[PDB]
Structure formats: C-alpha cells, structure tokens
Amino acid sequence: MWFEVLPGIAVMGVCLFIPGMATARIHRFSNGGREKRVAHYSYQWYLMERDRRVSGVNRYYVSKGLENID
Amino acid sequence: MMTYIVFILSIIFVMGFVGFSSKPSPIYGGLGLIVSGGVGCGIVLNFGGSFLGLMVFLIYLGGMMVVFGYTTAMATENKVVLGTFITGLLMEFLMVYYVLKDKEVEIVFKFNGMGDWVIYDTGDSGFFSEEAMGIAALYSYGTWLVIVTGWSLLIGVVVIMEITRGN
Amino acid sequence: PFFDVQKKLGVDLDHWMTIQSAEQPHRIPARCHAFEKEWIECAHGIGSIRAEKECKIEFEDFRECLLRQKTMKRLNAIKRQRDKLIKEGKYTPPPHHSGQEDLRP
Amino acid sequence: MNPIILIIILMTVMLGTIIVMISTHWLLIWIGFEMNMLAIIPIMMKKHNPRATEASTKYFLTQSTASMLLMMAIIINLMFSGQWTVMKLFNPMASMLMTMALAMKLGMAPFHFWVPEVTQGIPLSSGLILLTWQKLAPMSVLYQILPSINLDLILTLSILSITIGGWGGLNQTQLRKIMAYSSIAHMGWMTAVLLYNPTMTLLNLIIYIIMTSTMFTLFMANSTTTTLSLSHTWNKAPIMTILVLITLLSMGGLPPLSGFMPKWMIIQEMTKNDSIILPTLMAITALLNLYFYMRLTYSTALTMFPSTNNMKMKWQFPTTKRMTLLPTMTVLSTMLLPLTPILSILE
Amino acid sequence: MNLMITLLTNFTLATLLVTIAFWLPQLNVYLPFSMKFFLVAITFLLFDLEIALLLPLPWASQTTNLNTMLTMALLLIFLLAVSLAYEWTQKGLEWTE
Amino acid sequence: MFMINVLTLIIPILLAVAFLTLVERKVLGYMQFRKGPNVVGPYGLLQPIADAIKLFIKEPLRPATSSISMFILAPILALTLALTMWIPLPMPYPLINMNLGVLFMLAMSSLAVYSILWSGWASNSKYALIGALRAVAQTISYEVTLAIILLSVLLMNGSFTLSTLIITQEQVWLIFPAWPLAMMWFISTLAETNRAPFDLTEGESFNVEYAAGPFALFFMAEYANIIMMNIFTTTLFLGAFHNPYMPELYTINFTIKSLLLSITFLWIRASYPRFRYDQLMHLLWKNFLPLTLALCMWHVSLPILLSSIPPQT
Amino acid sequence: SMMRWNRERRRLQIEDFEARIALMPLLQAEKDRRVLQMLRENLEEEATIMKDVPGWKVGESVFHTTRWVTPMMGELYGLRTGEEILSSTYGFIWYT
Amino acid sequence: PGIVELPSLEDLKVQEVKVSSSVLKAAAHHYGAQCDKPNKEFMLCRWEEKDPRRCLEEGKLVNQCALEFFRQIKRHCAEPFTEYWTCIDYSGLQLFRRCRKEQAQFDKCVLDKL
Amino acid sequence: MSLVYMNIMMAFTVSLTGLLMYRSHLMSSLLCLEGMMLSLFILATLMILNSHFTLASMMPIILLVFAACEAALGLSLLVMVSNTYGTDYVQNLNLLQC
Amino acid sequence: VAAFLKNVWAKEPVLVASFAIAGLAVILPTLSPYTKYSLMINRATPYNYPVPLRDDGNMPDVPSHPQDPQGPSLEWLKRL
Ligand SMILES: CCCCCCCCCCCCCCCCCC(=O)OC[C@H](COP(=O)([O-])OCC[N+](C)(C)C)OC(=O)CCCCCCCCCCCCCCCCC
Ligand SMILES: CCCCCCCCCCCCCCCCCC(=O)OC[C@H](COP(=O)(O)OCCN)OC(=O)CCCCCCCCCCCCCCCCC
Ligand SMILES: CCCCCCCCCCCCCCCCCC(=O)OC[C@H](COP(=O)(O)OCCN)OC(=O)CCCCCCCCCCCCCCCCC
Numbered sequence A: 001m002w003f004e005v006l007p008g009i010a011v012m013g014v015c016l017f018i019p020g021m022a023t024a025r026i027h028r029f030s031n032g033g034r035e036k037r038v039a040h041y042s043y044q045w046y047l048m049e050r051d052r053r054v055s056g057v058n059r060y061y062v063s064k065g066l067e068n069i070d
Numbered sequence B: 001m002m003t004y005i006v007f008i009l010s011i012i013f014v015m016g017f018v019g020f021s022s023k024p025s026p027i028y029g030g031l032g033l034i035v036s037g038g039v040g041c042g043i044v045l046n047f048g049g050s051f052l053g054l055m056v057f058l059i060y061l062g063g064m065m066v067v068f069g070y071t072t073a074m075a076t077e078n079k080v081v082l083g084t085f086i087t088g089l090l091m092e093f094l095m096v097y098y099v100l101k102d103k104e105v106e107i108v109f110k111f112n113g114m115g116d117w118v119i120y121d122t123g124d125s126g127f128f129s130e131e132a133m134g135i136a137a138l139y140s141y142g143t144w145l146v147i148v149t150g151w152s153l154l155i156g157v158v159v160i161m162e163i164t165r166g167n
Numbered sequence C: 001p002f003f004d005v006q007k008k009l010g011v012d013l014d015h016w017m018t019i020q021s022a023e024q025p026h027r028i029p030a031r032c033h034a035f036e037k038e039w040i041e042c043a044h045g046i047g048s049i050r051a052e053k054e055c056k057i058e059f060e061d062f063r064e065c066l067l068r069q070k071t072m073k074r075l076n077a078i079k080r081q082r083d084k085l086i087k088e089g090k091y092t093p094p095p096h097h098s099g100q101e102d103l104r105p
Numbered sequence D: 001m002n003p004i005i006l007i008i009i010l011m012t013v014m015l016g017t018i019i020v021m022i023s024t025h026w027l028l029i030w031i032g033f034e035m036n037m038l039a040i041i042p043i044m045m046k047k048h049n050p051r052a053t054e055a056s057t058k059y060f061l062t063q064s065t066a067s068m069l070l071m072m073a074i075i076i077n078l079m080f081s082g083q084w085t086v087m088k089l090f091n092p093m094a095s096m097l098m099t100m101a102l103a104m105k106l107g108m109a110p111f112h113f114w115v116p117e118v119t120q121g122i123p124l125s126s127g128l129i130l131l132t133w134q135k136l137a138p139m140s141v142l143y144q145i146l147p148s149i150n151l152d153l154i155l156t157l158s159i160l161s162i163t164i165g166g167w168g169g170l171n172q173t174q175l176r177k178i179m180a181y182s183s184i185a186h187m188g189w190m191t192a193v194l195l196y197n198p199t200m201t202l203l204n205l206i207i208y209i210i211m212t213s214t215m216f217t218l219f220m221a222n223s224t225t226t227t228l229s230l231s232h233t234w235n236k237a238p239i240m241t242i243l244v245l246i247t248l249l250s251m252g253g254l255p256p257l258s259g260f261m262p263k264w265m266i267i268q269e270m271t272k273n274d275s276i277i278l279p280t281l282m283a284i285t286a287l288l289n290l291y292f293y294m295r296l297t298y299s300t301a302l303t304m305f306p307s308t309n310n311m312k313m314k315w316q317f318p319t320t321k322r323m324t325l326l327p328t329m330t331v332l333s334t335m336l337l338p339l340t341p342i343l344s345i346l347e
Numbered sequence E: 001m002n003l004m005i006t007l008l009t010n011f012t013l014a015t016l017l018v019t020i021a022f023w024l025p026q027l028n029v030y031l032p033f034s035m036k037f038f039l040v041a042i043t044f045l046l047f048d049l050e051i052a053l054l055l056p057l058p059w060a061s062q063t064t065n066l067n068t069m070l071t072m073a074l075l076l077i078f079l080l081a082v083s084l085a086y087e088w089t090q091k092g093l094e095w096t097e
Numbered sequence F: 001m002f003m004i005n006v007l008t009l010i011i012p013i014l015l016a017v018a019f020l021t022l023v024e025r026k027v028l029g030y031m032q033f034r035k036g037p038n039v040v041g042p043y044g045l046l047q048p049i050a051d052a053i054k055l056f057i058k059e060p061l062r063p064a065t066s067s068i069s070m071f072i073l074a075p076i077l078a079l080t081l082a083l084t085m086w087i088p089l090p091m092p093y094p095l096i097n098m099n100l101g102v103l104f105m106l107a108m109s110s111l112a113v114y115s116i117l118w119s120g121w122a123s124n125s126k127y128a129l130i131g132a133l134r135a136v137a138q139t140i141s142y143e144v145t146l147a148i149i150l151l152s153v154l155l156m157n158g159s160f161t162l163s164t165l166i167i168t169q170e171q172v173w174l175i176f177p178a179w180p181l182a183m184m185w186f187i188s189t190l191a192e193t194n195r196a197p198f199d200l201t202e203g204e205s206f207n208v209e210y211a212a213g214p215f216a217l218f219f220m221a222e223y224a225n226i227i228m229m230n231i232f233t234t235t236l237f238l239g240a241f242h243n244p245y246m247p248e249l250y251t252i253n254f255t256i257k258s259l260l261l262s263i264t265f266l267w268i269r270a271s272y273p274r275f276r277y278d279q280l281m282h283l284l285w286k287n288f289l290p291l292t293l294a295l296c297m298w299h300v301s302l303p304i305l306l307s308s309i310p311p312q313t
Numbered sequence G: 001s002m003m004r005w006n007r008e009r010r011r012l013q014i015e016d017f018e019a020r021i022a023l024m025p026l027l028q029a030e031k032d033r034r035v036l037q038m039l040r041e042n043l044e045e046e047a048t049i050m051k052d053v054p055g056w057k058v059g060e061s062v063f064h065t066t067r068w069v070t071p072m073m074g075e076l077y078g079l080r081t082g083e084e085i086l087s088s089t090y091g092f093i094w095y096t
Numbered sequence H: 001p002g003i004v005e006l007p008s009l010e011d012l013k014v015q016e017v018k019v020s021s022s023v024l025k026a027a028a029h030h031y032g033a034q035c036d037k038p039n040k041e042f043m044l045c046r047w048e049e050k051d052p053r054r055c056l057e058e059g060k061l062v063n064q065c066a067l068e069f070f071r072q073i074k075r076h077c078a079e080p081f082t083e084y085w086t087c088i089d090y091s092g093l094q095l096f097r098r099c100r101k102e103q104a105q106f107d108k109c110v111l112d113k114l
Numbered sequence I: 001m002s003l004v005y006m007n008i009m010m011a012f013t014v015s016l017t018g019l020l021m022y023r024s025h026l027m028s029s030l031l032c033l034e035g036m037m038l039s040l041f042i043l044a045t046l047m048i049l050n051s052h053f054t055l056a057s058m059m060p061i062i063l064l065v066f067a068a069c070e071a072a073l074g075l076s077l078l079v080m081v082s083n084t085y086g087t088d089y090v091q092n093l094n095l096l097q098c
Numbered sequence J: 001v002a003a004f005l006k007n008v009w010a011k012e013p014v015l016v017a018s019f020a021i022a023g024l025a026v027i028l029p030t031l032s033p034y035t036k037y038s039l040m041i042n043r044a045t046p047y048n049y050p051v052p053l054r055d056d057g058n059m060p061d062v063p064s065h066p067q068d069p070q071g072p073s074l075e076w077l078k079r080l
C-alpha cells in the first residue's frame, strides 16, 4: 500500500544524510576533535593565525593554555 | 605561480576581451564576455571584494548578459576575427614576456612586474567587511545617490516603454 | 558654470564621498589618510597655482602612498640583487627568511 | 507622447544637466550625463520613423562611447589623486581622455560626424534641445577642468571644428544640417577662448544659444526644414523673412549685430595673450559660415522665389503656433551689441 | 582555495559526464520577433538593477542614521512599486501579464 | 581530506537524484490510485539503475546543431551550477563556509538560465528556441521574487551567511514571522525549477534535440536543483535544532524536512493543472510582486519599529 | 519571538565585541613588535645584500616625511618564502 | 630621503603571552577589568604617537601585566579556567552562550579566591 | 604601478578598439560597450579596495546600475532598428547621409 | 470611502493587502515606542576600540575604569 514508497524515500534520505554527517566528522577529524574555526571577519582570521603561531606545530587548532606560560 | 594568481586571472580577462572584441558572432561574443565577467569577478574576489564580485555574477552576468543573450537569440535566430584574435593574443603575451623578464614595463603608464600581492595592507578590519560597510552606507550617507539612481531607473522604465511602443 | 548650490543651500549632496580623509563608516581609515590629510591641509585656500609648487612634497608623498611606485621599485632592486647573489652563490638566505623560526606572538 | 510623460522627461533632461552643473563629485557628473542621455532619447524618437531611430542610435553610440571615456578619465584621476573632486585633473592622460569625451559630447571635430546626421533625423524642437541645452553640461565640465586641459589639443579641436563646420555648411540645403555645421563652428569658437578667458566662452555660449533658439523658433513657426520651403515664407509671412534676415546676419557676426559680440571679444582675449595668427585665421574661416547664411538670406528675404497656387489657401489662416519668446529672442539676437560690457555679469 | 578546488571538481565531473554521454553510445554502429518577450526581459533587467540597489539592506539596518536609512529603503522599494505601477497601467504587462 | 568531503557531498547528490525519480514515480503512482514501479527491483528499487543503463546505451539523436560548442556547454553549465548550489548549504556545517552564501546561491541560480538559452539556440528548431525564450522569461521573472523575498527574510537574519540562519531560528521557525514570504517563496522556487503547475516545457500550449544521455544530464541537474531548493527552503524557513556536540540531530531533522518538502513538490504536480503562460506571468508580475514589495517594506520597517534588528556578525 | 531573540543576540554581540576590545591592547602590542621584528630583519638582510650596489642607502625611506608609515605587504614579506607570502596575503580571502 | 630608524632585535624581546585565542577570549572580561591601566596607557600612547616605535615600553608593560594576570589564575583557579576555555575552544565561532555554566564556575572561583 | 592595472587598462583599450571598429552587428558593438563598462567596474573596484576607501565601495555598484540601464536603452534601440530592416546591421543605418 | 473599500476588497484582495501592508510599513515606525531603542541598540554596539582620553585634570563624567559608576550604561538593554 502507501508504505511501498518508503524504501525509496529511506534510500534518498540516507543519501541526503551522508553529506552533512560526513562534513561534520571530517571537520572534527581535521580540526583536533572540534568544530572548524569560522573566520568570516579579519579579526577571527587574525586570532586563528595567532593560534597557528603560538601552537609551535603550525596548526591553529593545537591549543595552548596556562601550561605554556610559566 | 600562485603568488601571481590575480595577474593570471587578469591575463585570462584580457584574452576574453580579445575574444569577444574581435566579434566572431554576437552569441560567441556574449560567451566571451560571460567568461570575462567570471574571471574579473575572480580578480575582485581576490582583492577581498566579495559583495562586488557577487554583484558581477548576479547583476552583470545573471541580469544583464542574460538579457543580451536573450535579445541576441531573438534577433540573430571568419578571417578578420581569427587574425584580430591572434593579433591581440600576441600583443598581450608580448606584454607578459616584457613585464616578466624586466619586472617593469611602460606602455602608457609605468607598471611593476612583481606579483600584485605586494601592495596589500597588513592589518585587519575587526568584525566587519569594510567593503560591506561602505556599500551599506549608501542608505545612511548616500541619500542623494539613492535619489538620482532610483529616479534614473524609474525614468529608464518610462523611456523603454516610450521608445519601444512605436506610437 | 559650477553653480555651487550645495554651498549656497548648506546641503551636502556629494562632498562626503569626495575625499578619502572624509568621515567614513565606523571610523575606518583609508590607507593614505595621513598623506591625504597633509596634502589637503597644505593646499587649502592658497589656490591651485600655488598648490602645484608649494605642496609638491606632500603631494608626492601622497601619490607614492597611493601607487607605491618607489616602494615597488626599491623592492625590485633588492630582490633582483638578491637573486643575482643567489645565482652567483655569494649569499645565502637566513633561517628566518626560509621559514624555520616559529614567529613571535 | 503623453504630455505628463513629456514634462517628466524634459525635467529629467534638465535635471541631468543641472546635476552636472552643481556637483562636486565626478561620479555625479557622470550620473548627470547618463541621466541626460537616457531622458533625451525619447525626445529624439518623438515621431517614430526610421530616421529618428537611426539618429537616436547614432546619438546613443557616440554619447555612450564618450561616457565610457569620461569614466575612464575619472578612474585614472582617482588612481593618481585618490579623490573625486571636480577640479583640475591630476594626470595628462586623464585630461586628454576627458577632453576627448567632452569633445565627443559636444560634437566638436573630428568627433563632429554625428551632429548633422542626428540633427537631420530628429524634429526641429528636439534639435533645438540638442544644439542648445546639450552643450551646457560639457561646457561646464570644460570650465572646471581648464587648469589641466592641454592647450594644443583644445586649440586643434577648436580650429578643426571651425574649419570643418565652415566647409560643411556650404554644401547643405537642409536647414537642420546648416544649423548643425553652424553649431560645430561656434563650439570651435567657444573652446578656442576657453584657456584664455572662460567668461568669453560663456558669452559665446549664451549668444549662440539665443541665436540658435531664434533660428529654430523661426523654422518651427514656418514649418520649414529645407532652404526651398523657407523660400516660400515671403508669400505667407513677410515679417518672418525680415526676422530670419537679421538673425542670419547676426549669426554671421556682422556688426552692428549681437553675434559680432562674441568673436570680437574672443579676438580681444586672444591677442592679449599674444596669439595673433589664430584669431585672424579663425575670423577669416568664419566667412564660410557667413557665406551660407547669406545664401539663406538671398533665398528667403532678399529675393522672392516662386510660390505655389495652394499658398493662397494658407493666406486665410493665422499662425496658431506658440512662438514662445520669439520676439524677445529676435531682439536679443540682433540689438544687443550696444550692451556689450554687460558680459561682466558672467564673471 | 578550497572553493577553487570545489569548482574545478564540479566542472571536471560535469565535463566527464558530458564526455561519457556523447561518446559511450558511439561504440554501437546503429522565428518572428515578439516585442512582448523583449519587454519582459527588459523589465526584468530594470527591476534587477533596482534589486541590486536593495541588496545591502541587512547591513544598512545596522546604522546609527536609522531615520534616513528607513526613509531611503522605503523610497527605493516605493520606486520599484512605481515602476511596476507604470508598467501595469500603460499596458506593459499584457498578454504575458 | 577535503577532496573526500567534496566527493561525499557530490556523489550522494547524484544518488539522491537517482532515487528521487523512483520516489516521484511511486508517489505519483499511489496518488493516482495505482502502484508505481515495483517489478524491476525489490520494491522497485532497481528502476533508476535500469533506466540509467537504458539511457546510456540509447542511440544518439545526431543533431545538425547550429553550434557544437554551446550544445556541449549547456549540459556542462547546468550540471556544474547544479552541483555548486550545494557547497554553502549548512547541514549543520557547510562544505564551503562563506560569509555571503545566500547571495552566492542567488547568483549561481541566476546563471542557470544560460543552459536553457544555449540549448535553445544550439538546436536548429525555431520552436525549440521559442520554448527556450519562454522558459528563460519565466525563470528570470520568478528570480525577482526570489531575490526580494530572500532579502526580506534576511532582514531577520542580519547577514547573508547561511549558517547564521540556524542561529536566527533557535527560538522559533522563521515560517512563523514570514509565512506569506514562505508561501510566495515556495511557489517561486516551484516556478524556478520548471516544475508543475509551471512546467510549460511539457505542455502543448527546449532540450528536445539532445540525445538520451545529455537529456538525462539536464534531467539530473533539474532534480538536483529541486532537492537543493527544498533544502534551502528548509534552512530558510524551517530551521532545525542544532546541538554542536551532536550535529547529526540537525542533519536528521533538516533531512526529514527537506524530504517532506520535495514530496510536497511531488504532491503539487499530482494535484493541479498547468498554468497558461500569460497566467503565470500574471501570477508573478501582478500578484507576487506587489505583495513581495509590500512585505519587503514591512520587513524593512518592522525590526526598526519593534527594536528587533538582528546582529551583523 | 524574533523580537526577544534578536534583542538577546544583540546583547551577545556586545559581549563578543567587548571581549575583542579587552583583548585589543595585547594584540596591538604583539602586532607592533611583530612588524618591527620583520622590518628589522629585512633591514639587516638589505644591509648584507646591497653592498655591491653603488649609491645605495640601506634603509632609505621613499617618503619625504619622517612620519611612521604603515608597512606594505611586500615591505614585510618581500624576502620571505612563497608559502608565508601566500598565507599572509590570501589566507583570509581563501579561507573556506 | 632619510634613513628609517628601526629598533633593534634586543629592544623587541619580551616574554610573550603564548596562549591561544580561546584562552584569551575566556579570560577576556576579567583581563579587561584587571589589566585596565597599562592597556589604556598603551592605547592612549598608540593613538597619540601614531608610531609603534614610540610605544614599545608601554607595550612591554601590557605584555608584563597580562602574564601577571594569567599566573594569578594559574596559582588559584587553573582547573575551572581550563574547563571553561576548553568549552569555549570547542566552538567554531567560540560562543560565550554555549558555555554559561563553565563561565559561572570560573566566575565563582575567581570572585571567591581573588 | 601594480601589475593587474596594466591588464585591466589593456582590457579597456581592447574593448575600446572593438567598439571603435565595427564589423556588421550593432549587438557586437553593444557587447564591446559593456565590456568597456566591465573593465571600468573592475578597475574602480581594485583601486577602491586597495585604498581602503570605504565610501567609494558603493561607487562601482552605481557604475554598474546606470550602465546596465544604459545597456537596456541600447538593446531597445537595437530592437527598433531590427524592427525596421530585419537585421541589426550597422550598414542599414545610413539614411542620414542626405 | 466604505463602498469603494469593500468593492476593491471583493475584486482585488491582493492589491488591497499590498497597499495595507505598505501603509503599515510607512506610518507605524513613527507611532512605535520601540523605534528609539533600535537607534540606541545600534549606537550601543562597539565595533571600534574605545580610544581613551588624556586625563587633563577636570573630566568628572569620564571614568578612570570600566567598572566605575560614571559613563554610559546599558541597564536599559539588559532590562527592557
Ligand atoms: C515554505 C513552506 C511551504 C509554504 C506554503 C506552501 C504550501 C501550500 C501550497 C499549495 C498549492 C500551491 C500550488 C500552486 C498554486 C499557484 C497559484 C497561487 O497560489 O496563486 C496565488 C494567488 C493568486 O491569486 P489568484 O490569481 O488566485 O486570484 C485572482 C487574482 N486577481 C484578482 C488579480 C485576478 O494569491 C496570491 O497571490 C496570494 C499570495 C499569498 C498572500 C499572503 C497574504 C498574507 C496576509 C496579508 C494580510 C491580509 C489582511 C488584510 C490586511 C491586514 C493588515 C493588518
Ligand atoms: C550659464 C547658463 C546656464 C543656463 C541658462 C539657460 C539655458 C537655456 C537653454 C535653452 C534651450 C531651450 C530648448 C527648448 C525648450 C525645451 C523643451 C522644448 O523643446 O519645448 C518646445 C516645445 C515642443 O513643441 P512640440 O509639440 O514638441 O513640437 C512639435 C510640433 N508640434 O514647443 C515649441 O516647439 C514651441 C516653439 C517655440 C519654442 C521656443 C523655446 C525657446 C527657449 C529658449 C530661449 C532662449 C534661451 C534662453 C535665454 C538665454 C540663456 C542662455
Ligand atoms: C563557459 C565557461 C565554463 C562554464 C561552466 C563552469 C563555470 C560556471 C560555474 C562556476 C562559477 C564560478 C564562480 C566563482 C566565484 C563565486 C563567488 C565566490 O567566490 O563567492 C564565495 C566567497 C564569498 O564569500 P566570503 O565568505 O566573503 O569569502 C571568504 C572570506 N572569508 O568567495 C570566496 O570564497 C573567494 C575564494 C577565492 C576566489 C575564488 C575565485 C574563483 C575563480 C574565478 C572564477 C572562475 C570561473 C570564471 C568563469 C565562470 C563562468 C562565467
């Protein structure tokens, strides 16, 4: 009956679920277990490049806390 | 090579202009001006003009060249073109060769041959795009400009309806 | 006939976009704000004929801010002599001009 | 055309020129020219025939080309000065491009080739607007940029306009082409005195506008676009032949008339600057203009050409045309020379 | 940079699929001018320019000159409406209304 | 690693377009008191694969085209623009997080009329060119209300950023303050994709010279556009809850809403007759455009009068 | 609902902007020492390169004024590698 | 023209604040409260002199007063601050509004112990 | 000056010589005219973005809008020319020689 | 004025809704008490750095610290 349309709808829904889940997991894999930094404005980019310079490993996402000061 | 990306896009821009200005057919001329508008948008985007580049896409290519190709499709349906095209191409690549081997050229103005990244600013704008704020100031500071532009567009509507009527 | 209606009526139709040193949104400076301010305050009121000869220093500084021709010519000279000394082998770049020093902040 | 739409469009022509005259920013100059061209295109296509569409297309192409050259001159000025003030230009290339663009908008030679075609293609009232009101905005821009105008360029344009406008009107029998070549020669006279004294530029502009408006108003009042239809005027309205006689003798610059006033003052300003050959050759070249003006006075007022029989019907009907300001313009175009020192009001 | 890679990838995939679709089945042997359409295209162009004037409004609402900004925003949308009303009443929107 | 992210965007686009054809045939079956394809695959699931294999080996139509170059470029442009409309879509995170993603989508959708125009001119048939000019005039007409509705909505957003539009709708769906904009938006996106009741390319009152392959390419670009405009309408008016530590909640929620909205397109094509061409021109220029201008004035003036101007950043 | 939530978002924006403001003096001091570091390194390498060149004044200003001029991008990153150049001049524009 | 006068590499040496931007944003409001005076001295000097070379020593005082700010957090409230800037650091826009309970614990521990 | 300005000016001069050397079609002339406008847009935009001259950021938009309105007018003239002769050939527009 | 409105509402309700929504867009911001708060919130948003003043000796309204009592306050925005 009407539930016969549901397998194709389910396959199409899995195919629409893949890109967002994929980019979320790829952002967390590529950005140290966290969200990708949003730099829409040049201040956010300045802070991100400052984090890349203070990390010492040329990666913005490697965060340095109070252990890096004396 | 990647430090010269605005220069490379500007070369493709001049090549597209030599493409449509040699005038093969107004439909291929429309295509050449479309490709030129896209790469000129890319130049504008690489100087940080995101909104102005998207205005080239939305208004120039998506608005005006659509109407050009539309009118051309309603109106329409060589050796001079090819020679003119290779002439403009050889002039442009002689310009490229001179300004790359010399890092300086003078056609009418003096031009540096370094990568055009050198002229940029070394700071930040904080929490705004300066270009977005200057375009937003059309409503706060550009009152007279809004008045004369909107009046010219209303008059443009009236003028097109006058001259296309034939009565 | 420049009928100066804007000064006559006290209205600002287009003086605001005329110069870079004018009042900008969010007090955003132009890159040549100081040079343009110096050239405008030099050349103010003395007329264009006296401003050509008496404000030439500020105007040359301001044109060189706007187009950076002398700066790019100097960088051309330094980079060309550096490439010549690299080709001759009479110079080596330091580690901080090769990318091996882990910048300041 | 709807009369309300005609009024709004004519006010928009006027508004574009006024924006050019009052603005301090180069973008608003360019906007005033764009607004003026956009609004004046329907005035040229007022009667909807292929000659008006051809004239409007030629006018569009020349004025659009001049507008793009103007914007490139503005943009080069912004490169070399970082600003937009309507004053002297800060590059000789931008000065050359803006002088070329304004010469194209004026139709000065060797960019003169649209003016007889576009003037012939359009009605007499719209050609009146084209030859008088449309000179006002580019002359005001030339007025403000004269510290940067190259002398050799503007004088080359001036003498080339005077010679080409003199020889061009000699071959013409159409009245609109006669007024167009007369326009080209008078704009050459206006730009020749510009770098020396722009008050005499304004004087020549005003006297030219008065005399040209007088001649177009006479042509509209008699419904004449050819020499040979203007030659019927004596058998229909003999006062109009006297008026075209005195106005054409004035446009030739014959004293004691008012059109002797500009060129004399122009020579008076060009010899103070030790230029003697140039106003001499300019004045001798203006005898060409006087020759075809005299041709029109011979055909219209000083002889009686043969008429037709149907003219007897038009004897029974008076001119219902609004001949707006025609007696005032006829008096000002002829009897103004005793008031020549009034020119100081233009300073 | 990631955007240029993404545009190149979409263009490469589209060109590859078009090249497949034009050369995979090769293995087997086997108008009068209408003034009305031009007028609707020009009306699109003019209203599209008016839209280009309207596009910085989400940024323009952030100003401290809000009385002037609101006046000019309502004036631009009003002139777009007056353009539509003139297009309506002079029979410009007819037979493609 | 970024190329993996590009592929996991664009290959599931093609798979979802492939199975949208099955969903359409099944839903239009069961709304027409019959069954759809249920013979080829189990529950009909292999029908798009069989139809794709059938179209790839069908004989070329062999046109004597006016231009070969634009005949090739119209499917390339259509597919490229159909794939680039997906890259700023926040679901919850976009592939390309750009600050002006809304305006990017509006520009790249305004470019898609050249595929129609170039395919209509590249065909020899004058009537194919007439249908192409009608389709282009339809599309550029409804782009006007797309632009103005989208501007009026983003007056509540504060920016052109698509990811901010999730923040905008954390307390309420944006269909609650903007349901007239939402319904004119939805009908305008229906008329953008040449979708019924606006499909005059299928009515007897432009790409007929293409072979079965390039017709399938135009068709899959069109269904990519349909799924994309439903996703964009979902993000725009029916914004879901987003937990930043569990992004899949947002992905499941927007995916369900986007599927229901695509099925609503399918419901609409199975429910109404077509418009005549002057009638949808009347619908745009005389119905949607005056209301859209009035609501644009209202959504300019309303955040100022309520003190509800959104943030810029 | 949009009234309450946009007013809350404006308060949150003011809190973000004041965090930025409280951080700006440290960032400005670091930026000043950063650009003076880079100009001093460029000056020392100009001194050790431009010795054969006759009539060359090392560190000669191109401006007649002795006022501080904000350093251009090629003035700071001219002698450095292309990766640092490309980062500092197109990194924010090319970022995502 | 004249020779530009640059300060030496020894005059630019200072003990840097080597913490990330999420650490700075988490400590930002208390840093603007506690380190007000040398920061405003530096920014007054920076807007009046219009020259970074004339503002170095004041700038060093900024870099001297920030470190004393963080040590006084590291001596007393290192763990609530660490738990707070980690939650700030997770977010892509680094939202304050996602982290209100860690902020409340940090503000509680700072208001109590300092 | 900077190297991209050479190419944008050369693009303007190429489209200028295209617009000053007609072949047959009026449409090709209008395309060269709008290419001139596009190059003016790009050159203005690169100057204004380089200078950080904020208020002139609205200038190229205005330059776009007016000129596209100008382009609209040009297309209308072309159409009326094409409603007379069947083509948009510039050699049909020669009635005003006499 | 009453039969005309019912006539145009019966014939053309789209245009009646258009002119009504546009009229409410025009006249209602002049009648709203919250239009002032829009301006206050826009001028209370700190895009730039608050460049401090040199204490000449007599500025009683300018604070020496952010947590001082004098200066502009945002209690109206926290409360509303
Ligand atoms: C985004 C999520 C989904 C959103 C909703 C979409 C789902 C529903 C879809 C239904 C099927 C649609 C299939 C296609 C149909 C196309 C035809 C169609 O709809 O035509 C539209 C029709 C067209 O009208 P028409 O052509 O049918 O009627 C005849 C029209 N004349 C008179 C001109 C001949 O209506 C509209 O254009 C209205 C658009 C929406 C208006 C919303 C108004 C809101 C209320 C304003 C205030 C009113 C009170 C007065 C003032 C008060 C002030 C305080
Ligand atoms: C520093 C200087 C600043 C500027 C100073 C002022 C400059 C003024 C420039 C004058 C230009 C005037 C152009 C003509 C008016 C504009 C509108 C127009 O053309 O109206 C004429 C009108 C049209 O009639 P229509 O129906 O179209 O004709 C077809 C046949 N039925 O009706 C007619 O055709 C009726 C016939 C008579 C019309 C005569 C109009 C004369 C106007 C000019 C007067 C002289 C110039 C002003 C004084 C000197 C100023 C320099
Ligand atoms: C017939 C020819 C072939 C036709 C088929 C293929 C072409 C058509 C389909 C592709 C269209 C390409 C469009 C390219 C530009 C799109 C606009 C754009 O880049 O916008 C996104 C973004 C703006 O947002 P924003 O966040 O401000 O930027 C980052 C700052 N933090 O900006 C950025 O992120 C900027 C990133 C760097 C700059 C990117 C420049 C791209 C290259 C130039 C265009 C290339 C294509 C030219 C021709 C296209 C067809 C006209």
Ligand SMILES: CCCCCCCCCCCCCCCCCC(=O)OC[C@H](COP(=O)(O)OCCN)OC(=O)CCCCCCCCCCCCCCCCC
Binding pocket: E078, E081, E082, E084, E085, E088, E089, F289, F290, F291, F293, F294, J008, J012, J015, J016, J017, J018, J019, J020, J022, J023, J026
């Ligand atoms: C002041 C506020 C701002 C106003 C400007 C902004 C408006 C925003 C909406 C944009 C509208 C743009 C286009 C308007 C076109 C108007 C002309 C028109 O449509 O006339 C024709 C129409 C009869 O229709 P017809 O020609 O037959 O078309 C086929 C369908 N039958 O004729 C009619 O149906 C008559 C239409 C006019 C009367 C409508 C009255 C509505 C009153 C609502 C309440 C009062 C609202 C306050 C404002 C005052 C309005 C008068």
Ligand SMILES: CCCCCCCCCCC1=C(C)C(=O)C(OC)=C(OC)C1=O
Binding pocket: F014, F017, F018, F021, F022, F025, F047, F048, F051, F052, F055, F215, F216, F217, F219, F220
């Ligand atoms: C290689 C990836 C897939 C390429 C595209 C082919 C499959 C999708 C389109 C095929 C199609 C299907 C299934 C289909 O159902 C259909 O009828 C509605 C079509 O014709 C209009 C089709 O073209």
